[PDB]
Amino acid sequence: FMEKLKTYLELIRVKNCITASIGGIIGYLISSNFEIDILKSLLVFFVVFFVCAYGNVINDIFDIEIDRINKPSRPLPSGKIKLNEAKKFSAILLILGLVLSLFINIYALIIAVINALFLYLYAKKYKKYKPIGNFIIGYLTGSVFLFGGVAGKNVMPVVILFLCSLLSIWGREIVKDFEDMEGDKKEGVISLPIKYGKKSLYFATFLVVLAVILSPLPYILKIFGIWYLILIAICDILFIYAMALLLKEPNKETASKVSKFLKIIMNIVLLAFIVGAIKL
């Protein structure tokens, strides 16, 4: 049972779930301006944990055949957990996630249901179909914050965080698909760069540009102050500059550098929302 617990924790990818759950607490902290309720905190942390755990289990279930060749040591291809045990377990995690969100509010239930639908469909077919898949990665990463946000008293700045995360991550996913063009083509993967070439980079630029337009809104709405504004101004210029560089040099090496750079900026933007929330 010490080794069986190790296997179940490996199937749900417990560190990935904890990371997503901290994301949900971050959304809750911003929304409540650090005026944190412990019952509400536990509900946010565990709804995110269970829905994320469900997403990881449903991913392994659909990937059992692929993993038999690629990652044979995973819980399902190795035979340490039976397919039918994993399917029963995925149902439990989902029910716990959905039932716990009923104790937050209707907005939390809607997010939980939408996430569950996206997670199943991503695992089932959209992981390989990048035009829809890129959007799902963006939506799911951002929704984790929104989940904590709807539990708090002031969700508006978290709505902006969610929207900026969705758009910029969706944009960055396209940049990554441009970098991985050769390997994806010889793998039966469909993506915007494979289907449209360098034109896809204009759509990635558009998504980064909408995210930049929304970014000063918490300051404009008088929710956050000067520190948020200064950090967001630096990050907004760096986002535009990074995409202008990719558009001037549309190649694999540049897409790789821009992808790494956008990841760093996104983390500084997350810090800016936290710093803006530190208004106590």
Ligand X SMILES: CCCCCCCC/C=C/CCCCCCCCOC(=O)[C@H](O)CO
Ligand Y SMILES: CCCCCCCCCCCC[N+](C)(C)[O-]
Binding site for ligand Y (CB under 6 A): 2, 15, 18-20, 22-23, 25-26, 36, 41-42, 45, 87-88, 91-92, 94-95, 98-99, 102, 107, 109, 113, 116-117, 120, 141, 144, 150, 153-156, 159, 221-222, 227, 234, 264, 268, 271, 275, 278
Q: Of Mg ion, ligand X, ligand Y, none, which one does residue 219 interact with (CB within 5 to 8 Å by kind)?
A: ligand X
How many Å apart are CA 43 and CA 61, to the nearest integer?
Answer: 27
Q: Which two tokens stand for residue 218?
A: 């918490």
Closest CA to 172 of 201, 198, 194, 129: 201
The letter for the amino acid at 235 is C
Residue number, nearest CB to Mg ion: 76
Q: Of ligand Y, Mg ion, ligand X, none, which one does residue 120 interact with (CB within 5 to 8 Å by kind)?
A: ligand Y
Name which of residues 12 to 31 contact Mg ion (CB under 5 A).
none
Q: Of ligand Y, Mg ion, ligand X, none, which one does residue 255 interact with (CB within 5 to 8 Å by kind)?
A: none
Residue number, nearest CB to ligand Y: 23
Q: Of Mg ion, ligand Y, ligand X, none, which one does residue 267 interact with (CB within 5 to 8 Å by kind)?
A: ligand X
Which range, of 61-69, 177-185, 190-198, 246-254, touches Mg ion by CB under 5 A?
61-69
Q: Enumerate residues 6+ apart whose C-beta is below 8 A from 245.
A: 254, 258
How many Å apart are CA 113 and CA 197, to the nearest integer?
Answer: 35
CA angle 98, 48, 175 (to 5 degrees): 120
Residue 129 in contact with ligand X, rule: CB under 6 A:
no
Residue 63 in contact with Mg ion, rule: CB under 5 A:
yes
Tell me whether residue 185 or residue 264 sits nearer to ligand X (CB atom).
Answer: 264
CA angle 30, 234, 142 (to 5 degrees): 40
Residue 235 in contact with ligand X, rule: CB under 6 A:
yes
Q: Enumerate residues 6+ apart whose C-beta is below 8 A from 148.
A: 23, 24, 25, 26, 27, 28, 29, 30, 31, 44, 48, 158
Which range, of 68-76, 144-152, 181-189, 249-257, touches ligand X by CB under 6 A?
144-152
Residue 134 in contact with ligand X, rule: CB under 6 A:
no
Residue 266 in contact with ligand X, rule: CB under 6 A:
yes
Q: Of Mg ion, ligand Y, ligand X, none, which one does residue 129 interact with (CB within 5 to 8 Å by kind)?
A: none
Q: Enumerate residues 6+ apart whose C-beta is below 8 A from 15.
A: none
Q: Which two tokens stand for residue 50?
A: 């269970």
